[PDB]
Subunit: 132 residues, 2 copies
Amino acid sequence: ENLYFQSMLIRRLDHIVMTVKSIKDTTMFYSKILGMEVMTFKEDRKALCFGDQKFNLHEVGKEFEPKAAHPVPGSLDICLITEVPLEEMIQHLKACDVPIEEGPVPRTGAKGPIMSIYFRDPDRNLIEVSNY
Amino acid sequence: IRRLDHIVMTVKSIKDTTMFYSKILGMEVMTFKEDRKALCFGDQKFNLHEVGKEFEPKAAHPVPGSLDICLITEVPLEEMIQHLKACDVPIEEGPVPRTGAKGPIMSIYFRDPDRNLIEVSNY
């Protein structure tokens, strides 16, 4: 009954907690490479904002509770949609000397087929940047 | 303009994970590329892979239980709590006031089968 109700109620990701070796290195990378906004909250916390979502950052050895059972840097494999044409994103990554691991390639998005490029962040998380 | 589309979740058992997310959060179990499985919950999804089965490109460390995520629902948190209690899913924390990307949120926390931390919230 409640299973059925939840099946028809839309849900959305608000944020994810990313565990990193260095918050300084990660904030520098996401601000320069993807234009994410570096924000400070609760006086001692950092986040990367984009659109209506964010990444909360935890630094290895400085994690806040509660957290993932296994906070591991480099365990994330995420796909970000951008309205920026993928060709312009490729030009941007080449300019910033960020190697493109794969792409442009066709992939499956949540809402249908997407075009994607892949690259690594400082912790070797896999970042997929895509267009619908 | 940038938005999260999907995340890859590494799991011990696709059967256990799909049953949990379908029952507890009403996620749709979908099959794509003949054998691949995903959990669809709105405009986003979780792609699933069993431990050691995913091919490159993948995360440097595909680890079960490494996720710590927050999902917004329009379902009142009190109704969510009653659903988890009925399904015998322990609520680790909540309802508590927390910080969302767009402002304050009300949250509950619980573990999935791989002990990922799942925060379910309301704006």
